[PDB]
Amino acid sequence: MTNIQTQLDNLRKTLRQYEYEYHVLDNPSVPDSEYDRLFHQLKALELEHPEFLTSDSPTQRVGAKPLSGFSQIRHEIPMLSLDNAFSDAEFNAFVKRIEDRLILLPKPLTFCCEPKLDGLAVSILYVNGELTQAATRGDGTTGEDITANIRTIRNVPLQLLTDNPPARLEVRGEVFMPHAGFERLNKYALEHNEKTFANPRNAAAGSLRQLDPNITSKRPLVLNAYGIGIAEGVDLPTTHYARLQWLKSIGIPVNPEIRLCNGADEVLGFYRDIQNKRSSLGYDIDGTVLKINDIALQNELGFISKAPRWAIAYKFP
Amino acid sequence: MTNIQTQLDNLRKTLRQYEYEYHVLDNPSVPDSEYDRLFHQLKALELEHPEFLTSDSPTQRVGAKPLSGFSQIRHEIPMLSLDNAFSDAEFNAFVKRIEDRLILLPKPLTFCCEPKLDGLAVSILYVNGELTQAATRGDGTTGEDITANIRTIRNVPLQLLTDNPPARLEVRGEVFMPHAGFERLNKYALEHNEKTFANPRNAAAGSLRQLDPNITSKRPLVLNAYGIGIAEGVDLPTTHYARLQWLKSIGIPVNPEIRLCNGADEVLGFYRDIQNKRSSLGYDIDGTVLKINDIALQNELGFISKAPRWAIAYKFP
Ligand SMILES: CC(C)(C)c1nc(-c2ccc[nH]2)c2cc(C(N)=O)c(N)nc2n1
Ligand SMILES: CC(C)(C)c1nc(-c2ccc[nH]2)c2cc(C(N)=O)c(N)nc2n1
Ligand SMILES: Cc1ccc(Cn2cc(C(N)=O)ccc2=O)c(C)c1
Ligand SMILES: Cc1ccc(Cn2cc(C(N)=O)ccc2=O)c(C)c1
Known part of the structure; x- marks a missing residue:
């Protein structure tokens, strides 16, 4: 044990928890000046003792040197895209198509509704x-x-x-x-x-x-x-x-406006509540992403590959 | 002009047209022995005069040497996959989803129905x-x-x-x-x-x-x-x-069992006619591929990318 390693560990812990309270909860326990006070007290102490400087410290977010180019990463699990609707009738069609495709449709069908952030x-x-x-x-x-x-x-x-x-x-x-x-x-x-x-x-x-x-x-x-x-x-x-x-x-x-809904009639309430809120949210959204809340039913319904919207293989039993 | 080049051109023309009549039309004009007679008369003549041997002659279908491996070709236009249904209700849902999504739904909605060959x-x-x-x-x-x-x-x-x-x-x-x-x-x-x-x-x-x-x-x-x-x-x-x-x-x-249909009720007739015929077709099929016959409406409806069947982005107008 050393005095300096004790001070860095305690500062890093306090700051990572204050970032969590401000960013993730929107309920900080300290003013922004108290956060900075501990932040540049840590940064100064890390430069006075470079031996105890960690890679994941809150002071080490930025790299001092600009990079040569951008490497190529291939996704282990592929990153899926989204299908889209444009009317209450079109959304209700996607829902009936799922009610009729399920082996067992539960009463009620829970959906996790979120805003479709434009990012x-x-x-x-x-x-x-x-x-x-x-x-x-x-x-x-x-x-x-x-x-x-x-x-x-x-x-x-x-x-x-x-x-x-x-x-x-x-x-x-x-x-x-x-x-x-x-x-x-x-x-x-x-x-x-x-x-x-x-x-x-x-x-x-x-x-x-x-x-x-x-x-x-x-x-x-x-x-x-x-x-x-x-x-x-x-x-x-x-x-x-x-x-x-x-x-x-x-x-x-995660987004704070995410709510659960039971059945298409409740899910369409969320689409129009979020539509009124659109004009005073603080960021851009271009709709809502409506998802089947149960992970068993997701794996059961599965995913479509790159395919047309004008062709269907009505498969034999 | 030479006598040999005149004989090869005339034989190749006759044979390519006889292959077309047997394979594509199932209505040959000559017996299989007449076809072979001209075929090996051409092959013999092409080996006696190798100078006039063409790459695309009907005698040159097989390569004499087995290949080292298999190269990698990337598709200029990507090759699309297919979405699938399993019930009359699920097919009718896909159809209503298209009726409600179209800018202008015509009366009637023509579909090109084909068998889903298992190849x-x-x-x-x-x-x-x-x-x-x-x-x-x-x-x-x-x-x-x-x-x-x-x-x-x-x-x-x-x-x-x-x-x-x-x-x-x-x-x-x-x-x-x-x-x-x-x-x-x-x-x-x-x-x-x-x-x-x-x-x-x-x-x-x-x-x-x-x-x-x-x-x-x-x-x-x-x-x-x-x-x-x-x-x-x-x-x-x-x-x-x-x-x-x-x-x-x-x-x-192309498949000879392909027929046009106007509206889901006629399209479901084709699905069950092809279902009875399944047991006496001569090749395997695992359903039917039902497609929007108009190419304007295809480009209008478009295609889905690799995406879930349990998530929909109800987009804002
Ligand atoms: C269904 C799946 C694949 C989990 C997915 N995907 C996206 C998305 C965006 C770009 C590719 N996928 C998405 C994007 C958003 C968004 N833009 O807020 C969201 N709320 N949910 C999303 N869910
Ligand atoms: C809609 C699209 C993309 C033109 C398409 N695709 C396939 C197919 C098979 C494998 C990938 N795509 C297909 C396959 C069949 C088939 N198996 O007979 C068919 N009758 N029609 C097909 N149509
Ligand atoms: C000077 C300064 C420092 C920090 C911030 C914002 N902030 C505050 C906290 C906090 N209250 O716990 C934590 C992280 C953070 O990023 C601003 C706007 C200005
Ligand atoms: C010996 C032999 C030759 C050809 C064929 C089949 N066939 C027939 C024709 C034809 N009738 O015009 C054309 C092409 C072809 O492939 C068989 C089964 C047997």
């Missing part, structure tokens, strides 16, 4: 609680190594907030820029004659493609997790909402 | 009427070069039967082995202690994966074209059935 899909790997790599969705099978960029997102934890983390956990989410940060970014790009982005999705997309993480750190990017990929050394919950609640409990940011 | 999907390229390459579907983006194997299929023309062929045409079809040939193949593999296949789909799949085309030539494989890929130097018809009729008119084999 970029990314992967984040957590090997024994530590962020080892992050990748863009790319084509759904092969993406780019954007780890340095993903490490700069203030609400993306560099370490999971659990003493028993899984062996490997791939968090999957949507990276986006909120309205306030977007407004700020254009006004700064106007007063310094630089690129202005047409909307917050292009602003976030461009910020994540920057080779220098010192530029990405200055962009107000935000992660909201929508699912899990690799899951080793853990027994994940039997429903989608419980898995999202589980991600939140170990340090991962 | 292997392949690509065949025709550069200015000549068969230059063939590939397996693989993953739908990348497949294997099986040109030598595809050249051995007796009903696959090595040259298109038109004096104005397109610049490039990619025919897409299902390669399969009929019942009679399958029964024959096992009995021969039993009396010569060799591999027996569980069903005609495994027998065809294995025959197409053979490196030696002298082995694939002895397997009774058959192509039935289901669609087109690349189409350069041609204005293709506005409907799916007319494109299939067009393929047949230029030398390509």
Whole structure:
């Protein structure tokens, strides 16, 4: 035991927990000045004693050197896309198609309804609680190594907030820029004659493609997790909402507007409640993602591959 | 002009037209002995004068040397997969989902209904009427070069039967082995202690994966074209059935049991007529592929990517 290693461990613990309280809960226990006080007290102490500097410390989010290019990562589990509806009738058709396809339809059919954030899909790997790599969705099978960029997102934890983390956990989410940060970014790009982005999705997309993480750190990017990929050394919950609640409990940011619904009539209430709220949310959304809440029924219904919307193989029994 | 080049051109023309009449029309004008008479009269004459031997002659279907391995071909246009139904209710749901999604639903909604052959999907390229390459579907983006194997299929023309062929045409079809040939193949593999296949789909799949085309030539494989890929130097018809009729008119084999239907009630007649016929067709089918006949409405409805069957993005207007 040393005095310095005791101070760094205690500071890092307090700060990672204060980041969790501000970012994930929107309920900080201390003012932003108390957080910074401990933050630059830790950073100064880590430079005075470089021997005890850790890779996943909250002071080490940004890399000092810009990268040569972007590597190629292929997704272990492929990253799935989404089918889309445009009317109450079209949504109700997708629902009847599932009621008639199920071996046993339960009473009621629970759905996990979330907003369809207008951002970029990314992967984040957590090997024994530590962020080892992050990748863009790319084509759904092969993406780019954007780890340095993903490490700069203030609400993306560099370490999971659990003493028993899984062996490997791939968090999957949507990276986006909120309205306030977007407004700020254009006004700064106007007063310094630089690129202005047409909307917050292009602003976030461009910020994540920057080779220098010192530029990405200055962009107000935000992660909201929508699912899990690799899951080793853990027994994940039997429903989608419980898995999202589980991600939140170990340090991962999820959307707060996600609610459960029983049957298409309740699910259509959520679509129109979120539609009124759209005009005063603080970030862009282009609809809602409505999901079957039970993981047994997901594996039962399964997935479609790259196929037409105008052709169906009515298979024989 | 030479006497020999006049005899080869006239023989090749007669034989390619007799193959078309037997294979594509099931209405030959000459007995099988008359066809062979001209065939080995051409082959003998081509070996006596090797200078006039052409690459696409009906005598040159098989390569004398087995290949080293199988190359990797990536599909220019990707090869799409299919979504599937299992009940009258599930098919009617897919149909209502399309009626409600269309900008303008016509009265009536024509469908091109075909049997779902239990074979292997392949690509065949025709550069200015000549068969230059063939590939397996693989993953739908990348497949294997099986040109030598595809050249051995007796009903696959090595040259298109038109004096104005397109610049490039990619025919897409299902390669399969009929019942009679399958029964024959096992009995021969039993009396010569060799591999027996569980069903005609495994027998065809294995025959197409053979490196030696002298082995694939002895397997009774058959192509039935289901669609087109690349189409350069041609204005293709506005409907799916007319494109299939067009393929047949230029030398390509298509299924004869394909019929048009107007509305789900007529389309379900075809599903049950083909279901009774299943037990006496001569080849394996595992259902029916029901397609929107108009190409305008196909491009309008579009295609789904690799996505779940339990998640829908109800997008905002
Ligand atoms: C169904 C599946 C595959 C778990 C999925 N996917 C996406 C998504 C975005 C890009 C590729 N996939 C998604 C994206 C969002 C989003 N944009 O907020 C969401 N709420 N849920 C999503 N769920
Ligand atoms: C809708 C689309 C993409 C034109 C298509 N695809 C297939 C198929 C088989 C394997 C991949 N795709 C197919 C396969 C068959 C078949 N097995 O007879 C068919 N009759 N039609 C098909 N149509
Ligand atoms: C100077 C400064 C420091 C920190 C923050 C925001 N913030 C606050 C906390 C906190 N309250 O526990 C934790 C993390 C964090 O990022 C701002 C806006 C400004
Ligand atoms: C000996 C022999 C030769 C040809 C055939 C079958 N056949 C017939 C014709 C034909 N009638 O115009 C054309 C091509 C072809 O493949 C068999 C079964 C046996």
